[PDB]
Amino acid sequence: KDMEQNSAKAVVLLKAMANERRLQILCMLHNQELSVGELCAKLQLSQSALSQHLAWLRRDGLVTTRKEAQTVYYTLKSEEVKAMIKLLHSLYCEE
Amino acid sequence: KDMEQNSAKAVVLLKAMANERRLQILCMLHNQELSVGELCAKLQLSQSALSQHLAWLRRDGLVTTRKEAQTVYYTLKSEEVKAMIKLLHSLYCEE
């Protein structure tokens, strides 16, 4: 019943974070709002591939956007992902 | 440098948890030591497939074992996974 529904909900979030590039994006958005350009410069990633990771994180509800006429700013969306990144940040990001 | 080493270390742990069955096993081991039989009865899983999940979790350092002459008892191993399950438990396991 709920065991398979909650397990699925959590797995969706875990699968979205179980990627080196996707995790680095989320960790950078910890208590911070960044644009596509700011992420591109801080990650050495092509815009085409960076847009693919952002699309995956957006489709699964891990990040939400805000536009400043054409510039898109990204930020962590769900409280579950915010708590997940906060804990991971202290375990691996030295803070 | 460390960015790709720490990201890899965290991804290994996230990939191990990004599975409905593997996550249910870890959640059951939260502050609890259980044998193979106790897990088999509480999860409706075949012993062959349950041993495969336990082997994956063991190889990646998420669980460690203890034997009582022939009975194997499982428990969460790393402090990182213990903190991860503790947070997930409060977000989805209602406690």
Numbering used by the authors:
A (entry chain A), B (entry chain A): 4 to 98
What's written in the study?
HlyU is a conserved transcriptional regulator required for the activation of various virulence genes in Vibrio species. HlyU homologue in Vibrio species is a key regulatory protein that induces the expression of various virulence genes, suggesting that it could be an attractive target to develop the anti-virulence strategies against the pathogenic Vibrios. In the present study, we performed high-throughput screening of 8,385 compounds and identified a small-molecule inhibitor of HlyU, CM14, that significantly inhibited the HlyU activity in V. vulnificus. In conclusion, we identified a small molecule CM14 which inhibits HlyU activity by covalently modifying Cys30 and thus attenuates the virulence of Vibrio species.
The overall structure of the CM14-treated HlyU is similar to that of apo-HlyU. However, there is an extra electron density map around Cys30 of the CM14-treated HlyU suggesting a potential chemical modification of Cys30. Although the moiety attached to Cys30 is partially visible presumably due to the high flexibility, this observation is consistent with the above result that CM14 modifies the Cys30 of HlyU. To this end, tandem mass spectrometric analysis was performed for the CM14-treated HlyU sample. Figure 6a clearly showed that the Cys30 residue (C#) in the HlyU peptide, RLQILC#MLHNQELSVGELCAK, was covalently modified by the moiety with molecular mass of 130.042 Da, indicating that a certain part of CM14, probably consisting of C9H7O, is attached to the Cys30 of HlyU. Notably, further comparison revealed that CM14 induces a conformational change of HlyU, thereby substantially decreasing the distance between Cys30 and Cys96 from 8.4 Å to 4.1 Å. In addition, we found that the distance between two DNA-binding 𝛼-helices (𝛼4) in HlyU dimer by 2.9 Å, which may account for the impaired DNA-binding activity of HlyU. Taken together, the results indicated that CM14 reacts with the thiol group of Cys30 of HlyU via a putative chemical reaction involving Cys96, and consequently inhibits the DNA-binding activity of HlyU. Altogether, the results indicate that CM14-mediated Cys30 modification substantially changes the HlyU conformation, and thus inhibits HlyU binding to target DNA. Biochemical analysis indicated that CM14 prevents HlyU binding to its target promoter DNA. Further mass spectrometric and mutational analyses revealed that a part of CM14 covalently modifies Cys30, a well-conserved residue of HlyU proteins in Vibrio species, both in vitro and in vivo.
